[PDB]
């Protein structure tokens, strides 16, 4: 589809940043290389549930005064289309199929079948966690239900699995048209304290490494690549300098549209028409 790396990053960094900063030993492991006093000061200031200081995230032109003790600025950069397919045909499909999902689900007993139930109608199922079925298991999917033969499998009547699938829009024929784009977003950890800046750098690098295994960039925002500027004053004429070290995050993804085709041929009918010449 059409996608926006800035919205992806903003949506993804915030929970990850929260979950790291609520978890002291992670920071203690991230900041193991830094000086003891730097580490302890940052941990006591920003880290753990008692921490009163907090780190904030937002876009680059707010009208209000931001946090400047510790803030992450996300800033949509340049981008360029890099590789084209013949005819722009990126793919083609017999069913309009949306995002991929992962859900936790459990087996439940219908008197003929175990069923795993999914929040949405399933367009295709990719995995049931640590199950490989045989034909005897009579694996079948229908709507929002994944169904699985009970008769041998009562020992798994409440087995807990993660379902990897993708939603269905509708059963229709179509083509997916567009090209790959190589695109950048700059991020900078603003702080009026240089050592805070350097910690926010380390924390953001850790977060961005961890994001490489997330399904979002794994499917779509592939080939994450990181570059870093010097640490420098962003603003140098207040009562104190505001410092930051920019990092640039580059991605590859496909911009494309679902081009449906309503034409199809249902039947071939053969005639012989005779020419007397």
């Amino acid at each position: 589809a059409i996608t926006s790396v800035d919205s992806y990053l903003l949506s993804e960094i915030k929970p990850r940043l929260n979950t790291v900063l609520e978890n002291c030993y992670i920071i203690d492991e991230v900041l193991k290389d830094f000086d003891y006093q730097t580490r302890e000061s940052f941990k006591e200031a920003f880290c753990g549930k008692n921490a009163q200081h907090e780190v904030t995230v937002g876009f680059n032109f707010p009208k209000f005064k931001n946090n400047y003790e510790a803030h992450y600025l996300i800033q949509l950069g340049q981008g360029q289309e890099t590789k084209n397919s013949l005819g722009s045909i990126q793919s083609s499909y017999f069913e309009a199929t949306g995002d991929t999902l992962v859900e936790s689900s459990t087996a439940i007993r219908e008197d003929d079948k175990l069923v795993f139930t999914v929040s949405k109608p399933i367009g295709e199922l990719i995995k049931v966690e640590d199950i490989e079925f045989a034909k005897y298991d009579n694996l079948q999917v229908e709507g929002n239900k994944v169904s699985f033969k009970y008769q041998t499998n009562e020992d798994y009547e409440n087995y807990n699995a993660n379902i990897i699938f993708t939603e269905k829009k509708n059963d229709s024929k179509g083509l997916v048209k567009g090209f790959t784009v190589e695109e950048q977003v700059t991020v900078v950890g603003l702080s009026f304290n240089v050592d805070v800046a350097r910690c926010l750098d380390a924390v953001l690098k850790m977060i961005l490494i961890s994001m490489r295994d997330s399904i979002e960039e794994q499917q779509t925002f592939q080939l994450q690549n990181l570059s870093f500027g010097d640490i420098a004053p962003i603003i140098e004429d207040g009562d104190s300098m505001i410092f930051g070290r920019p990092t640039i995050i580059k991605y590859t993804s496909s911009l494309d549209l679902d081009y449906t085709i309503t034409q199809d041929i249902n039947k071939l009918t053969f005639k012989e028409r005779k020419d007397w010449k």
């Binding site: 083609s92 017999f94 024929k173 083509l175 085709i261 034409q263 199809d264 041929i265 249902n266 039947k267 071939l268 009918t269 053969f270 005639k271 012989e272 028409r273 005779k274 020419d275 007397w276 010449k277």
Partner: protein
Amino acid sequence: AVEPFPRRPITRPHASIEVDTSGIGGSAGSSEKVFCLIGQAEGGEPNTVYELRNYSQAKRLFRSGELLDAIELAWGSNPNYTAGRILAMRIEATWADKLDKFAHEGGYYIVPLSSKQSVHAEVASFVKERSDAGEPMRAIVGGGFNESKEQLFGRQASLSNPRVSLVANSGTFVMDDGRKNHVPAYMVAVALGGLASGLEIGESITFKPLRVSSLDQIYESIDLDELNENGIISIEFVRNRTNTFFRIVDDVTTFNDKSDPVKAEMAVGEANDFLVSEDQFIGTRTINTSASIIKDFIQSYLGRKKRDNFPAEDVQVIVEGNEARISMTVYPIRSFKKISVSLVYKQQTLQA
């Protein structure tokens, strides 16, 4: 259908045999071109259609009348061909109600033994009413003992129909009793109908001989052309040889049109009335299609088939509304009416 043995179903342990007979069924071939006559007779029960198989049976049922002379001519014009079945009815005025009785008697050519134009129009109407149904038919008719060309043209124009032919000439037949029987032209039409019934399916009566002793009128080449172009059948007295004989000029029809053989020429109409006409892959196997790739696919298919066993210029494809009609041209067997010889005189140097 597939037959179960036993016919009764069974659920306890058993064997059952299913027999596919369909690999052996036959008799699917055509009807023969049974011939039909209506006219005056003695003896026979009027307005009853009789099948007849030989002249003795005819003289046993019918007697002493022009229908029996007709049956004689109907088997006498074609002595070198199969003497097939004939259907005949004594008629004791409207004729449609009688002609209705032939409706489900499986015969292809009919001749009324009458020169009256009302009769001929009735017969043409009957042939139409049958042939627009599932059971095609044709008729042949003739004039009286001597009619002018302008009378014949007027008759043909009034009776202009793609399933009726008019025969112009009249003459004398030697009967098997030795009688020199002078007959009106509709008995010559009976003789031609007999020949046409005897010939194979889509053979043609043009340039076949007529075993007739004499003709009332002999038409010169210009008159033969005039009658032929007007869609009237005429008989030529072949004079270019010591072995003189009478020849059927053509099998033309009273509807004459240059733009369609099937209505102009009787034999190709008959072929169309008797000819016989003779794999799918569905779009779900592909993401999108067009008439161009449908054509190229079916060309690749029939190329493979004709290599194992068709010209790209001769297949048409139309796609409409999820449906694709593929239309092949096919070539039926006609019969020659023209031969054109270009003779070039060269000369050659001999040397020795």
